[PDB]
Amino acid sequence: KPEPTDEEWELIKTVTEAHVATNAQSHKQKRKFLDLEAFSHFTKIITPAITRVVDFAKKLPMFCELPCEDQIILLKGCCMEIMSLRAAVRYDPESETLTLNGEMAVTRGQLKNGGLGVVSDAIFDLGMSLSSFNLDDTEVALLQAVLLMSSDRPGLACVERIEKYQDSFLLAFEHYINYRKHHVTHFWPKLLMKVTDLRMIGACHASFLHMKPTELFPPLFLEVF
C-alpha cells in the first residue's frame, strides 16, 4: 500500500493548513440551533462562506500561478461543492442538523425552504454517509483541492496544467488514505463516489437560473450562481 512521499507530506501540510485557516470555528460551541423571505435570510449568510472558499484557493500556490480568468471559472465551479462538503462533515446525528457558516445549525426542512430544494436531501444524505468515513481536516482539504482543480470546466485556458495539479492532489490523497487505514472497505473507490456526489450538487447550479428579482440577492451569490 503506497504511502505519502516527502513531497506529498508538504502538499498535505499546504492544503490542510489553507483549509483550517479558512474553515469557520472544535469551536459546536458557537452553534445556533435556529418563499423569498427565507431565501433572502439564507443568501445573506452565504457571502462569508464564498469568501472563505476564495481564501482557501488563494492560500494554495498552484492556484495563484493560474491566470485570474482561470481562477474565476475554477471558483464559480467549486464554491457550492466545497460549502456543501464543509456543511455535510458538520452533521450531528443527535440534532439531525448541518452547521452552516461559523455555527448556524440548519434542518433538512429549513434548508429546503431556503431554496436548495432536492439539494438539501442530497447534502443531508452525504453528511449522514460521511459520519462513518471519519474524514480529518487533511482529507476534507484534499477533496476541496480535487474539486477546485477541475479541467472539465468550460472556458479554461490551462486545461493541461490543472489536470496535472489534480493528479498530484489525487495521488497524495490516496497515499494518505493508505497511511490512515480507515476501518471502512473500498475507502478510496468510495471517496471517488462522494466526489461525484459533491460534483452533482454543483451541476444543479441552474436549480438558481430558473429560481432567479436579481437585486434581492447578495452580489457574490450572483457572481458564482
Partner: peptide
C-alpha cells in the same frame, strides 16, 4: 463581470 471576484482574487 466577476468584478467583486477579481477584486477578491487580485487582493
Amino acid at each position: 463581470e466577476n468584478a467583486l471576484l477579481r477584486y477578491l482574487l487580485d487582493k
